[PDB]
Amino acid sequence: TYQRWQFTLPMMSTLYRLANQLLTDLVDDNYFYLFDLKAFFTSKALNMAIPGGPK
Amino acid sequence: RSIWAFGPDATGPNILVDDTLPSEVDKALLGSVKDSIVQGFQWGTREGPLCDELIRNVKFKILDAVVAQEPLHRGGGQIIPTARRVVYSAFLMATPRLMEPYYFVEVQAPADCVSAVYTVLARRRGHVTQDAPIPGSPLYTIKAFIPAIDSFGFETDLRTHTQGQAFSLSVFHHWQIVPGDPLDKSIVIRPLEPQPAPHLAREFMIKTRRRKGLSEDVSISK
């Protein structure tokens, strides 16, 4: 039924290296400060647009 | 040994000193009005003549205190307002200045964003005291001084210009003099423009007076 997977660390490392081209390579969520879901919710509620964000 | 009071509170940053000579004024009679001059000075420093703000770092010296012998003339609601008025007038002769609260900011940021921290600070009258590596960590600590008024949104500016990689905590440190001279009518201020430093004090004084509901300007006199 293919509904659950258990992997070993040497396989996860290889899969992680192969997909690096699609990966942000960030280690934190500080990059999304004032640019995350809560900020956009607040801007929509306050009828304002963060520069570079949704309007 | 001539100290009478210690500012608006028991530990206020102002001092009251009597320089009345024993020959010129009888000290025993001066003791009758000491307890009232102290209260008048405390209240006057509590209010302040410029913009109803505290007075700081000012030494008041009494030079001559002519006292009426009749106790029915002195004491109570007659000598206290006189003391407050003389405190105000004496303060106003020596060039009054305003004082900003200065914030102490510590910023932790990677090595590359240190220059960005400098750039953010430079726009808000900030003055960087020191940057230094954190031993055993790849980050740096920048310690700087920023005026409290030129600090609103500083944290947000720093965290946005650096993409969240720099974080700052600010705490009150000391009081420093505003660059301008509050008592100078020559300066013309527009309603909605930032002012140059040469006359920041004049704006800070008149706008605070308007906010408090007082008159538009002081009446420098005796």
d(Cα B13, Cα B212) in Å, to the nearest integer?
A: 23
Which are the contacts of B86, defined by CB distance < 8 A and separation ≥ 6? B40
Tell whether A34 is within 8 A of chain B (Cβ): yes
- Please report, as a single letter, which amino acid is at residue B89: S
Distance of CA B123 to the CA centre of its chain: 23
Side-chain half-sphere exposure of B129, counting CA atoms within 13 A: 10
Residue B84 vs residues B15, B130, B135: alpha-carbon distances, Å: 14, 44, 55
What percent of chain B is helix, strand and coil (3-state, nearest 5)? 30, 25, 45
Sheet holding B3-5, edge to edge: B3-5, B15-18, B59-62
Helix (H, G, I), strand (E, B) or coil at B56: coil
d(Cα B45, Cα B11) in Å, to the nearest integer?
A: 12
CB-based burial of residue A5 (10 Å sphere; 0-12 exposed, 13-18 middle, 19+ buried)? Answer: exposed
Instruction: Return the residue in B160, B161, B168 with the most chain A beta carbons within 10 A, the one to mutate for interface testing.
Output: B160
d(Cα B12, Cα B214) in Å, to the nearest integer?
A: 25
d(Cα A49, Cα A40) in Å, to the nearest integer?
A: 8
Chain A nearest-CA distance from B161, in A, is 11
Instruction: Return the residue in A33, A34, A35, A50 with the most chain B beta carbons within 10 A, the one to mutate for interface testing.
Output: A33
Using an 8 Å Cβ cutoff, are B43 and B77 in contact? no
Alpha helices by DSSP H, listed for B94-141, are: 114-122
Chain B nearest-CA distance from A34, in A, is 8
Q: What are phi and psi of B34, to 5 degrees?
A: -60, -50
Using an 8 Å Cβ cutoff, are B63 and B37 in contact? no
DSSP B158-210: HHHHTTT--EEEEEEEEEEE-SS-SS-TT----TTSPPPGGGHHHHHHHHHHH
CB atoms near residue B89 (< 10 Å): 14
Q: What are phi and psi of B36, to 5 degrees?
A: -95, -40
Resolution in Å equals: 3.1
Side-chain half-sphere exposure of B158, counting CA atoms within 13 A: 26
What are B3's two structure tokens? Answer: 């100290």
d(Cα B48, Cα B13) in Å, to the nearest integer?
A: 13
Which are the contacts of B147, defined by CB distance < 8 A and separation ≥ 6? B100, B101, B102, B103, B124, B125, B176
DSSP A10-23: HHHHHHHHHTGGG-
- Please report, as a single letter, which amino acid is at residue B105: V
For residue B167, give the chain A residue with the closest CA: A30
